[PDB]
From Swiss-Prot, chains A, B:
One of its GO terms (molecular function) is scyllo-inositol dehydrogenase (NADP+) activity. It comes from Escherichia coli (strain K12). Keywords: Oxidoreductase. It comes from the Bacteria. This is Uncharacterized oxidoreductase YhhX.
Amino acid sequence: VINCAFIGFGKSTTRYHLPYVLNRKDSWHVAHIFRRHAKPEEQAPIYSHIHFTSDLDEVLNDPDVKLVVVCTHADSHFEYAKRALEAGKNVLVEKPFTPTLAQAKELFALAKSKGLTVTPYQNRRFDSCFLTAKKAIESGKLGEIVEVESHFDYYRPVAETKPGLPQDGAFYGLGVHTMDQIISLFGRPDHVAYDIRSLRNKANPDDTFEAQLFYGDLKAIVKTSHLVKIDYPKFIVHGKKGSFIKYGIDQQETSLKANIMPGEPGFAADDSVGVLEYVNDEGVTVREEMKPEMGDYGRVYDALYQTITHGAPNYVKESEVLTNLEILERGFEQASPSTVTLAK
Amino acid sequence: VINCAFIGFGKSTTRYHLPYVLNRKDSWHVAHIFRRHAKPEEQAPIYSHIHFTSDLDEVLNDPDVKLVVVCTHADSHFEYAKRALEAGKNVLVEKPFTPTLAQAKELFALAKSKGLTVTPYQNRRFDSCFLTAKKAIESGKLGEIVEVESHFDYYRPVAETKPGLPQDGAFYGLGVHTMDQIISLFGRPDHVAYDIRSLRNKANPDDTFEAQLFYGDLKAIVKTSHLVKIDYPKFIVHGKKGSFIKYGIDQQETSLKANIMPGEPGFAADDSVGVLEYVNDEGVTVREEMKPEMGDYGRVYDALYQTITHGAPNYVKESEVLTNLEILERGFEQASPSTVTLAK
């Protein structure tokens, strides 16, 4: 069993992490939880075994803790990650990994010297919708892939005034997850075309974007908007032999918000299906309905266990992290719309 | 009744012009049809009243001819149009208007000096799918428009090798129509983002494209691909108060190919509907299913009638034509993908 520690006890901790970790008692043990103010959500029995503390000193000096999870405000992610590594602990950092690309390299350099692992929390690589699109692409039924389109939208027309930097916009906010999915499938692109804008409140950072990643002749589109009344399909994949369409997004989050935990009845209840229409070897057009693949954000921790306990490679490659961060930053080199060619 | 004449007697003339013109005998009379070589179709009883000739002068010298329709090979459009205007005739030209922007500008200057009308044939401005989207946009129900998406796709995976120039590709071929629709609604864009690729056969001109026209904060997307097994909606429109979605394209071409002529029972029969979902002034979400507006390519001739007889403005504005040609040309200004800003 690996002893882990969480830095921060906010909603992200209690909703997107603990439910999955506390469900793996035979593999993980939440030894510490750092934070300041409390929450009437601490008096709960489920956290009875945890040592909540307001001194990050006791956490990092614990020889038993092998993993620190940073779930605090974005501004503190870099420093907490660095301090944890200098203490000799592996680190999982929620988005953002670091404010800048240079800092990401810095963090990776320190970890490599100590021979430790530092990585972002890319839990959406395990979304049911995404996994279904992945299975469809790896089935080979679609032939050579020529286009992929991923949507992550809302219909939230009212935006309270809240100025910020690019890092506070939707491109960094949601694009980091959606683009990471694309990169995890096709790697690093040759070119990137950007369309970034602020539609709801002109005082705020972008709330609408579309990034087009070009891999040779394959174009991968990632887009989000807070002004979509009628939803687009969650994923669309076109290949020379056929198409795959998936409406509906992973339901883990919906369940968690409705106070339904992993393993519990009706968790991630999903009645959608992926549609697959292609031409088989015999030249006959076939149409199939795929039952959604199962999603499990917990797989992040099962992979971390592998890395820490057996030296297994990190579920998220360093290059995929840097590529993603680099694409995000270059989207601001010149006013939108713009196009760039990735050097490295 | 206005007398007209056609330069060229190919498929375009017998499929997209005559069926409509011959249904307006109280408005128009086809006096002559020029063609370099006699064609078998000239023997169809429906053309018995038409004088077919290989002597162009016999047409341009006819005092009663007021409109000349150029439907020959693209490379001869400028030459025939200029000759018709010099003979004092109004001119309607099939795609492409001219090979270049300068020639187009030259055609308009000549027409202006003679008080004549020269215009392209943009019949898709009367496609039922497009007209329904236009009605939705003009209804005000969607509120400020932020995104428009137009698709004109196929699933034709086989493309025999047939080298050519940019002018032979899908962008010039189909984009001329889809971009014209966007231009007729919003005008001249500030910027254009291009993605032009040749996927089926690398030896051939482009068969895949996506042009993004920006009008302030509004983005209009026009795209086509010959590798779409599962179709996208024909039009998608998103505004701040709602959305409009329309699957299915105008059915006039389908009827024409099935040998059903305009005015005949069942012509362009369409069972699709435009779907609308918006938030009303009271804050309630309203759902509406719109019956497709009726499309009629002959409305081009009804417009030419008014223009020629009563001096009504031409259905297509000069600026829209020049903007279209410029956008198409600049798509090959640099390697794809690319973005450009329009001075006009």
